[PDB]
């Protein structure tokens, strides 16, 4: 219903209507964003601008140099990470090996961290100013663009909210039905949290794989939440600025990142800040949280 009755946000049909005819193939965003899409097999990096569901290709370079194939696990495996990240601002690393400037991705992200991954320093940068050769072993997992393309890259990403989407081989795209059901699940989860409905709340977490820190056990989490939720205090929780993105992976899972602003009120405790769920869609089409900020 276009009147948006109470509970609409928990309804897949509402989100399908809201997405409408938007191109959500690289995500469904509440902000204008840019998406740096790299495919490690094709050696193509593109930047797409997303404005209210209109996609425009603003940058493309073929024959890029990425790091090694396979998803990054540790510092020094030289792999370029697969997944969904963000891009920081142009900076000067102070080393001409990286070309004229560089841009830092956010590897390791929370999901990486709770999975016990290590490493860092996954940047997009250029080629050594001495003209020496690069190859997939020399970038240490970074992505190298031609130095004569970097000014245009810098211009396209400047002053924007910029995400990093790195595929291994398969072309990964979001689907309208998946985004809509994930958003329905997101607000169903919010309702369980609001109502301190512990069993429903916990059912949105992957009992097998969800972790808040390396090697956490799920009962440590469930037991803590059962205790906390037994207080049944009145809660008011608001989600906003929702940016939901397909999450390439090599686990044969359908994964998404759901980033949103969280605004939480109780009488004695309030917080607000940037939140993130890293989730899979399980075999039944249900959201299963793998990592939560």
Topology at a glance:
Blueprint: H1 12-19, E1 28-29, E2 33-39, E3 44-51, E4 54-62, E5 83-86, E6 102-104, H2 110-114, E7 123-125, E8 143-144, H3 147-157, E9 161-167, H4 176-194, H5 198-202, H6 218-229, E10 236-246, E11 254-265, E12 270-281, E13 287-292
Parallel strand pairs: 2-9, 7-8
Antiparallel strand pairs: 1-10, 2-3, 3-4, 5-9, 6-7, 10-11, 11-12, 12-13
Helix pairs in contact: 1-4
Give the CATH architecture of one domain: Beta Barrel
What is the string of SSEs from the N terminus onward? HEEEEEEHEEHEHHHEEEE
CATH superfamily of one domain: L,D-transpeptidase catalytic domain-like
Largest sheet, order of strands side by side? 1-10-11-12-13
CATH class membership of one domain: Mainly Beta
CATH-defined fold name of one domain: L,D-transpeptidase catalytic domain-like
The gross shape turns out to be globular
What does the main sheet amount to?
A: 5 strands, antiparallel
* Strand-residue proportion: 25-35%
Q: Got a strand count?
A: 13
Judged by helices, strands and strand pairing, the structural class is alpha+beta
Q: C-alpha Rg, in Å?
A: 20 Å
Q: What is the count of helical runs?
A: 6
Portion of residues within helices: 10-25%
What is the rounded distance between the termini?
A: 32 Å
Keywords: Cell shape, Cell wall biogenesis/degradation, Peptidoglycan synthesis, Signal, Transferase
Organism: Campylobacter jejuni subsp. jejuni serotype O:23/36 (strain 81-176)
InterPro entries: Cds6_C (IPR056203), Csd6-like_dimerization (IPR054516), LD_TPept_cat_dom (IPR005490), Transpep_catalytic_dom (IPR038063)
Protein name: L,D-TPase catalytic domain-containing protein
